Amino acid sequence: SATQSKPTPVKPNYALKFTLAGHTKAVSSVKFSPNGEWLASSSADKLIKIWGAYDGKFEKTISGHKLGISDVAWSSDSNLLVSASDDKTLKIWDVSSGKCLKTLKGHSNYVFCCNFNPQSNLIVSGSFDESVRIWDVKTGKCLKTLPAHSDPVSAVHFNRDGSLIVSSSYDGLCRIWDTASGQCLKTLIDDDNPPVSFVKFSPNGKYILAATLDNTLKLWDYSKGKCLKTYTGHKNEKYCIFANFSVTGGKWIVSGSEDNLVYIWNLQTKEIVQKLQGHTDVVISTACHPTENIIASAALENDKTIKLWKSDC
Amino acid sequence: XXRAX
Numbered sequence: 001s002a003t004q005s006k007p008t009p010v011k012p013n014y015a016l017k018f019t020l021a022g023h024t025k026a027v028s029s030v031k032f033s034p035n036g037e038w039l040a041s042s043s044a045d046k047l048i049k050i051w052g053a054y055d056g057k058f059e060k061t062i063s064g065h066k067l068g069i070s071d072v073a074w075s076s077d078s079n080l081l082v083s084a085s086d087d088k089t090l091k092i093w094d095v096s097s098g099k100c101l102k103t104l105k106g107h108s109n110y111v112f113c114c115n116f117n118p119q120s121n122l123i124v125s126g127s128f129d130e131s132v133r134i135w136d137v138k139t140g141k142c143l144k145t146l147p148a149h150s151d152p153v154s155a156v157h158f159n160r161d162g163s164l165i166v167s168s169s170y171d172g173l174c175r176i177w178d179t180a181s182g183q184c185l186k187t188l189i190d191d192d193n194p195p196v197s198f199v200k201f202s203p204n205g206k207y208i209l210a211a212t213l214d215n216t217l218k219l220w221d222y223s224k225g226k227c228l229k230t231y232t233g234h235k236n237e238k239y240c241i242f243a244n245f246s247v248t249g250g251k252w253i254v255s256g257s258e259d260n261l262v263y264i265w266n267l268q269t270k271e272i273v274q275k276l277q278g279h280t281d282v283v284i285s286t287a288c289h290p291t292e293n294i295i296a297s298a299a300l301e302n303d304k305t306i307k308l309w310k311s312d313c
Numbered sequence: 314x315x316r317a318x
Binding site for chain 1: 315
């Protein structure tokens with residue numbers, strides 16, 4: 001009919017815009033600055049690199065760690081980074097000067113995952129030493145060490161007002177912690193205990209998204225302790241792969257995968273809605289821009305690049 | 314890197 005019309009899209013149309021080359025070993029993590037202007041990348045090559053978020057343009061290299069870096073995270077004001085290294089330290093960095101303001105010492109094995117609280121006066125760490133640590137940003141001193149898990153800590157994240165920390169671990173557990181006391185408020189291991197490879201609060205802080213090394217993502221209502229959604233179809237049995245809520249357009253779940261693809265799911269229906277092809281090794285990390293429909297993806301040793309993808313909604 | 318194997 002002459003009155004037929006283009007239906008409203010129910011899937012994103014992410015398309016490769018840029019490829020960011022520079023790291024000389026596997027990339028470990030990519031994160032967009034809260035102000036949307038920058039992307040930071042960590043790598044096994046011991047370096048952090050900064051890139052323009054919209055043009056993929058290399059900006060600078062930040063160095064000082066003596067071994068490889070598994071994670072990097074921005075402060076709320078986009079002025080600081082914290083990095084987590086195999087050299088058993090975290091380092092706080094001034095982005096504009098590239099100088100290390102503080103070296104956070106105390107973990108007795110690889111530091112694996114890192115994050116500021118929303119206020120950015122605290123850093124939370126997770127380590128292969130099975131501990132979670134909470135650090136004072138201004139002094140660089142360890143405020144609390146939590147006996148968080150019985151195997152390496154894979155992820156660590158503050159909720160939206162900083163009152164809670166969620167942690168994941170190869171011991172199969174997700175735990176929620178009271179920032180103020182360090183007390184454990186909840187343990188989820190509702191059913192079997194495959195290693196929990198990643199976890200993160202939902203933006204509204206009422207859900208947690210957790211990856212397990214059985215090719216599964218689960219959205220949890222943690223106040224109820226129930227699994228609300230399950231996302232399958234990707235491959236994730238080995239590496240600690242980042243997942244994300246994409247909220248700028250349609251509501252998706254985004255994750256890398258060990259088949260070298262970026263997977264995009266409809267958060268509500270669990271349907272795979274896009275798979276992004278291009279990387280030549282495991283996509284270890286993805287991130288979603290805070291205001292625009294942009295995804296960054298990063299890959300391991302046989303790739304070493306970051307890719308920026310953009311969609312129309 | 315520990316995350317990259």
